Structures are given as C-alpha cells and as structure tokens.
C-alpha cells in the first residue's frame, strides 16, 4: 500500500516542474541577484548581474511575454534594468532587519542629561512632528536631516526614540551594517523600502545608526567593491535628498564620528542640524541608572543620584555596569534591593576592573 505514494508527490511535480526546469535549461539556463538565461542568440533577454557575461535587457523596448528569459531566474536580477520586466525576480535579504519602533518605550528614559540634543532634537523633530506648519509658517521645514554623533544609541537612539515617542512618531532605526551586506542594491532596496515605508510611516524618524558602517566620505571606492557600498550610500543620498518629505519624516544618522560623513550627507537641505549625543551626565546616569535598576531588584533608599555622583560621565549603555552589575551585588550582598555600596562597588569594580 505504501509503495509508490512518494513518487507522484514528486515525479509529477518533478516532471511538472521539469517543464520549468527545462524552461530554465533553455539557453543553458526571486530571489534574483543574477538571472542566468544564457547565450540565446537570435533573444537573450536577460539581466546578468554577474561576472560571466554581465547583461541587460533594456535600451529600446525589450520585454518577453511572461518571462524575459529562463534560468528559473527570469527577471531583472536585483539591480534593475527597465521594468518589470517579467514580474519580480528579485530580493535577497528577507525584508528589513532595521529597527522601526513607533512610540518607542523611550519618552524620557536616557533623555536624562541629553537635553541639548533633545532640545536640538525638539525643533528638528519634536516641534515639527508636533507642528511642521509653524516651520512652513517660519518658511522652512524642520532641519531635513540631523546628524547625531558621539556615543551611539546608548541614549542616542533612545533620545531619538524619545522625541519619536515624545511625539509618538514612528521611529525607524537603521543600521549601516545592515545596509552594507552581501549583495547588490542591499541597502538601496532597503533604503527604498525605507523610503517606501517612510512616507507610509510619515511623521516618523528615519534613524541611521552606524553610518560609519556604510562608510562615510572615503577614497575606499578605489578598491572597486566598495563602490556598491558607496552606490548604496549613493542610492540613499540620491534617494534621500529629493523625495523624503522632511517636515514630517525625520532623517537622523547615529554615528561615532561626525566628520566621516559623505560630503553629500551634511549638505544643507539634506543634513541641516548636526547634533552630538550629549553624554549621559551626573543626572542622566542617575535616571538612566534608575531605569537600569528597575529591572534589577534595587535599593530605593539609596539614590541613583547617589551613585551617579561617584561616576564620571559615561555612555547611557554602560550605566548598567553601574546598575545591572549589582544584580550580583544584590545577591552578593544578598540585598534583594542592591544597596549604595553595591553599586558604588560596581562603579568601583567596573571602573576599577576597567583599566582600558
């Protein structure tokens, strides 16, 4: 009874797809980076995005009724030439691994200590996400893009997330490393789908962490593979410049270095305001601490003010080395509520043991 049953599950689909198979295998041929539909000379109807016979269909009206050609690959590769042509052959990494958080948990969280930024964020981001109108009534729009540098994302993203959530705007965090990945048009399409979902989410923050990841201004395009990286940067810049409505949508770039920027980036009308993440301070740490503490069981008789007194100004992320380090001190001191010296020792310990 159980003899043949697996066969027609396949042999059919086999022989069936064996059309598509042999419909690939013509001319020795989603997710297209490269359609290979090969040496059809009458006709070849192919984008080869490839080092073997790199090919393009367009320049003169060129399509093919269902399918440009073959490969099982029929289509535009990923780097697109004309349209569609035969419905999407394309992408390539799943959709987006970038962060889009509307109304982030941060309204005031690491907002402690960063206010200058946050204030600079306000008119760039808050007041326009509040009222772009006044800016149109000013005659401008908000600063159309805003560089943030210094320590990234510690509060920096959160500070962006703040005004994102302080205005309840959609917060699109984007990682430049995500933008620079292993195929063509990698970020581009994402940058597209960004800009797609941008005006979908508009009155939103497009936020780029690690614009040093995609690289900034560099001669490194001389290597020849970094051009794509630049091309992605080109893509973005090319894209981001004109058609991002920047009265609603917010353009923000997190980075370590403000200088690395591709000169196109900091250009007026692209990046107007340029902000440093304000380093979490004696106060900021306290509250940034206090929040870090709330996950822990922590003593409230002590103050994160008290701890941040001791601590010099450090990144909103490291302020857990203050706090979350004493989850052990909580159970080291066996104070379920970790005490002052618990975190003082943490400030001692982590900075003591720091030595970097």
């Amino acid at each position: 009874l159980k003899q043949t049953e697996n066969d027609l599950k396949d042999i059919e689909a086999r022989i069936k797809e064996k059309a598509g198979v042999k419909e690939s295998d013509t001319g020795l041929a989603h997710p297209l980076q490269v359609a290979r539909c090969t040496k059809i000379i009458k006709a070849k109807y192919v984008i080869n995005l490839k080092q073997i016979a790199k090919f393009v269909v367009g320049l003169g009206e060129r399509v093919s009724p269902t399918d440009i050609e073959e490969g099982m690959r029929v289509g535009v590769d990923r780097s697109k030439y004309n349209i569609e042509l035969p419905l999407p052959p394309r992408i390539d990494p799943s959709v987006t691994m970038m962060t889009v958080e509307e109304k982030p948990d941060v309204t005031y969280s690491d907002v402690g200590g960063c206010k200058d930024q946050i204030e600079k964020l306000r008119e760039v981001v808050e007041l326009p996400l509040l009222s772009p109108e006044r800016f149109a009534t000013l005659g401008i729009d908000p600063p159309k893009g805003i560089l943030l540098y210094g320590p990234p994302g510690t509060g920096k993203t959160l500070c962006a997330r703040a005004v994102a959530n302080r205005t309840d705007a959609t917060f699109i965090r984007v990682i430049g490393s995500e933008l620079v990945q292993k195929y063509v048009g990698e970020g581009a399409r994402m940058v597209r789908e960004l800009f797609e979902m941008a005006r979908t989410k508009k009155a939103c923050i497009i936020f780029f962490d690690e614009i040093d990841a995609v690289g900034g201004a560099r001669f490194d395009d001389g290597a020849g593979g970094d051009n794509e990286v630049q091309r992605t940067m080109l893509e973005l810049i090319t894209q981001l410049d004109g058609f991002d409505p920047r009265g609603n949508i917010k353009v923000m770039f997190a980075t370590n270095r403000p200088n690395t920027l591709d000169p196109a980036l900091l250009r007026p009308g692209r990046i107007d305001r340029k902000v440093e993440f304000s380093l979490p301070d004696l106060e900021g740490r306290a509250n940034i601490f206090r929040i870090h503490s709330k996950s822990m069981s922590v003593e409230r008789g002590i103050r994160w003010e008290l701890i941040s007194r001791l601590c010099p100004n450090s990144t909103g992320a490291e302020l857990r080395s203050v706090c979350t380090e004493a989850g052990m001190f909580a159970i080291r001191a066996r104070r379920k509520v970790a005490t002052e010296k618990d975190f003082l020792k943490a400030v001692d310990k982590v900075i003591s043991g720091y030595k970097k």
């Binding site: 022989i15 042999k22 013509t26 000379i41 009458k42 006709a43």
Partner: protein, 245 residues
C-alpha cells in the same frame, strides 16, 4: 526497433560540408528519402536550411525554399520524402534538443516517422564519423512498446543508421588517390635529391640499435624491436627508386 536508415553519402557529405562549416550552428534543413516498407529510411538528399540567425528551431524551418528547390528539384527530377532532421551538434553525443525533438516531433508528424540526425561536426572530422538520428517513439517496437502506452517516452533513442551508394562513385571516389604515368613512377621518382638523407636516415638507423641491442644485458624499447621497424623502413623506400633507374 532495429530500423534501417539509408543515406546518400552525397547528402551525408553535403550535410557534413554544410555541417563542418556549420560550426557553431546545428545545420538544418530537409532530409530527402523515403521509407521502403518498414525499417527503411532512405536518403537521396537533404539540404541546408539557409543560415538561421534565429538558430535551429521548429520555427527557423522555412518550407519556402525547399519548394523552390523542390520545384527546381522536381524540375531537376529531384524528389523525395522529407525524412527527418539532421543538425550539427558541436561536442554533443547526448541528444540534440527536446526542442529539436519537438521540432522534429512537430515534423515527423508530416511523415510516418522522421529522424533528427545528431552530428558533431567537430567529432565528425576525426577521420571516423560522429552521428546519430533520434526519433523517440515506436509503433510498438520492432513490434519500445510499454513506455509509450505508459506515456512519458523520452530518451536519446537513436535509430539505426546505414547508407548505400554504389561501386560507381566508389571508383569516382577511389579515383581520389595521362595520369599514373604522369602521376606515379615518375612523379616521386624524386629520391636521389635526398640520398644524403636517404643515407643519413639509413645512417641514423645504425646508432639507434647498438643502443637497442645493448639493453639485452623489463618492458619495451626492447633491445630487438625498433631495430627492424627502423632498418626496415629505409630498405623498401630505397628499393622503389631502383624501378626508375
């Protein structure tokens, strides 16, 4: 199943010529012949389709020119059945195209049956021939049978080729090689020009052998081998010249 194909070597060479030069393309066109009772694939003729800048296809077949010819051929008295399909398949044992099949398959329709002649014009040139004809299906068989009624017949499935000409052209062929007297004795009595070599050639033989014999003191190069094959090649070629003198 054991089926008798018969070729005009004319058509054969005609194709070859067309095919030899046809590289890259599979050469295309008619196949003129018939079927005498069963099994019998006769070929008087064939011919190029003119170049297909669309390449070999069920499409690239133009029956215009055939008729044109076929008329002029009918005018020539030249008339046959178009018996199938013959193309030039560089480095292809394999099979030609399911297309070519379908191509033929569309066409063997026009017959009881047809062929698609495999040719590697590359591998043809070898001094032996490389070639096949598929027509993939049977009646039953030499009557093969089952896979047809069970459907899904696909394979290489060659036919069994042959051909015939005559002793007539055979002469005219072997006419290859006034004539002999002018062609032969006397025409290559040139030797003495090389006597030095003819010596030296013979001279060189000597050395090779003291060498060879010596090893007597294993496998080939053997002390008593190339000896004769060497001193025996300069013996004759040196006697034929005597005929002239």
């Amino acid at each position: 199943t054991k089926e008798t194909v018969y070729i005009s070597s004319i058509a054969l060479l005609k194709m070859l010529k067309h095919g030899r030069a046809g590289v890259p393309m599979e050469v295309m066109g008619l196949m003129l012949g018939e079927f005498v009772d069963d099994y019998t694939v006769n070929v008087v003729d064939v011919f190029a389709m003119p170049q297909s800048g669309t390449g070999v296809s069920v499409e690239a077949v133009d029956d215009v020119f055939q008729a044109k010819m076929m008329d002029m051929l009918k005018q020539t008295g030249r008339d046959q059945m178009v018996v199938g399909w013959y193309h030039s398949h560089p480095g292809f044992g394999c099979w030609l195209s399911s297309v070519d099949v379908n191509t033929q398959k569309s066409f063997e329709q026009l017959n009881s049956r047809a062929v698609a002649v495999v040719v590697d014009p590359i591998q043809s040139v070898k001094g032996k021939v490389v070639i096949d004809a598929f027509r993939l299906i049977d009646t039953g068989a030499l009557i093969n049978i089952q896979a047809l009624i069970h459907g899904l017949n696909r394979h290489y499935y060659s036919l069994n080729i042959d051909y015939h000409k005559t002793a007539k052209e055979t002469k005219m062929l072997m006419n290859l090689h006034y004539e002999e007297k002018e062609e032969s004795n006397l025409a290559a009595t040139k030797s003495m020009v090389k006597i030095a070599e003819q010596y030296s050639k013979r001279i060189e033989e000597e050395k090779e052998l003291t060498e060879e014999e010596l090893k007597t003191r294993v496998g080939r190069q053997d002390p008593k081998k190339h000896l004769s094959e060497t001193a025996d090649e300069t013996l004759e070629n040196n006697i034929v010249s005597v005929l002239t003198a």
